[PDB]
Ligand binder design. Structure first.
Ligand SMILES: [Mn+2]
Ligand SMILES: [Mn+2]
Lengths: 293, 83, 74
């Protein structure tokens, strides 16, 4: 049973890498195994060094393939994706299918987090629902992928020292034990700890503030310093805003923005970047251009 | 274990410019009347005069955060001596 | 930018701040000659202004002690 599913899933990886969509029953089985493998995973999953952390993909599949050509193939280099790989891109189902199949194939080598775009309402309004209707035909595969987004872990921890999440901090979160105590098994609300986890963003302020997004908050250097000191952390990695250079060290070498989708929405022209934590926590930046088409 | 006699001893030490012993016996009287400060000290032992004398004893021993905390204790908070 | 970069690390000195705000506004008022002294009071010469003090209601504090009643400096 393990051998036949392993070789079938490897053929699924090979068929995904050449940009071919799967079938509905194959997505059914992939999503069911993904549900089984993601049930036994905490809100703060400890990812051991080394790991190559990548940021937002947002359904740019050829850019994802280039990313695998830069940082290394998925069997050989560890990856940690901070969500938001589903909307604002032409090839959306292939990207999420490749990530989920790589997760269920390599359970210690691919870590997948949850973004704010990976919810029912946002996928319904910003494009994944339409892509679902135009390729697979009905809205049922969107139902499996929304449940799969529902089970995804929120944050991740690298060697007890680097905190990786999609959005930003929270006025209601003070310790990492509160992250592990949240009920993750629900769609992201309009108010609460987890909406702020997936929606907040840093800014050069002196305190909290209403984010110009309709949800989440915004935080400054004092808040980030307090969170890093009170939790034994030294770095907060996140991927929520478009960056030209692909990386930002804001809040005085404490908060790191890593955007990994070059030419966002195919009209912005940003040079994306990813971070490569070695076995000595001894990092480097891989900065790349969009793929030829 | 008689609080009034301890207050008298503390006042005699305070009059003879022995601030450490006066503070010791004031604290000792507070520990007699309340069960080692488990309940609140009654106002007939730590009067405003007694707390003010304790504040003066802390001030002349160059312990100023203790002066601020100890002058929160009064019925009206003495902000001038705190500052 | 100056709104989002405020740090609350001072005393509750309401009178001096209120006098400073009024001094700014009345300063430009008397610069422009909006108020014609001696020639009457013309309410058509008008510079509409609303000032909003957002505070907490704590005790009024100076460097010497707490002040019970609010007096503007003269
Ligand atoms: Mn995204
Ligand atoms: Mn996002």
């Amino acid at each position: 049973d393990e051998k036949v599913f392993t070789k079938e899933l490897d053929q699924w990886i090979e068929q995904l890498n050449e940009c071919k969509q799967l079938s509905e029953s194959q997505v059914k089985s992939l999503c069911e195994k993904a549900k089984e493998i993601l049930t036994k995973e905490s809100n703060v999953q400890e990812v051991r060094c080394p790991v190559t952390v990548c940021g937002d993909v947002h359904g740019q599949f050829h850019d994802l393939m280039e990313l695998f050509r830069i940082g290394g193939k998925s069997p050989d280099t560890n990856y940690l994706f901070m969500g938001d790989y589903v909307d604002r891109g032409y090839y959306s189902v292939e990207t999420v299918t490749l990530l989920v199949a790589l997760k269920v194939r390599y359970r210690e080598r691919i870590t997948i987090l949850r973004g704010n775009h990976e919810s029912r309402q946002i996928t319904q309004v910003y494009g994944f629902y339409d892509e679902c209707l135009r390729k697979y035909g009905n809205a049922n595969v969107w139902k499996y992928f929304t449940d799969l987004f529902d089970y995804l872990p929120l944050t991740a921890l690298v060697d007890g020292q680097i905190f990786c999440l999609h959005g930003g901090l929270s006025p209601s979160i003070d310790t990492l034990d509160h992250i592990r105590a949240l009920d993750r098994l629900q769609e992201v609300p309009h108010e609460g700890p987890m909406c702020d986890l997936l929606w907040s963003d840093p800014d050069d302020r002196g305190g909290w503030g209403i984010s110009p997004r309709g949800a989440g908050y915004t935080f400054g250097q004092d808040i980030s310093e307090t969170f890093n000191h009170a939790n034994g952390l030294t770095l907060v990695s996140r991927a929520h805003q478009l960056v030209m250079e692909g990386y930002n060290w804001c809040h005085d070498r404490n908060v790191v923005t890593i955007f990994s989708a070059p030419n966002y929405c195919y009209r912005c022209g940003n040079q994306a970047a990813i971070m490569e934590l070695d076995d000595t926590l001894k990092y480097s930046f891989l900065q790349f251009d969009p793929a030829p088409r | 274990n008689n609080h009034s006699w301890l207050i008298i001893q503390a006042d005699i030490y305070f009059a003879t410019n022995q601030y450490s012993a006066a503070l010791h016996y004031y604290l000792q009287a507070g520990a007699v009347c309340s069960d080692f400060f488990n309940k609140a000290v009654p106002p007939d032992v730590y009067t405003d005069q007694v707390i003010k004398r304790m504040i003066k004893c802390c001030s002349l021993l160059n312990c100023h955060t203790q002066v601020a905390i100890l002058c929160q204790f009064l019925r009206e908070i003495d902000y001038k001596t705190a500052f | 930018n100056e709104l989002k970069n405020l740090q609350a690390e001072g005393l509750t000195t309401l009178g001096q701040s209120l006098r400073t705000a009024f001094d700014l506004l009345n300063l430009n008022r008397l610069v422009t000659g909006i108020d014609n002294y001696g020639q009457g009071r013309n309410p058509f010469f008008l510079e509409p202004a609303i000032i909003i003090t957002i505070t907490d209601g704590s005790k009024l504090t100076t460097t010497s002690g707490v002040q019970d009643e609010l007096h503007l400096p003269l």
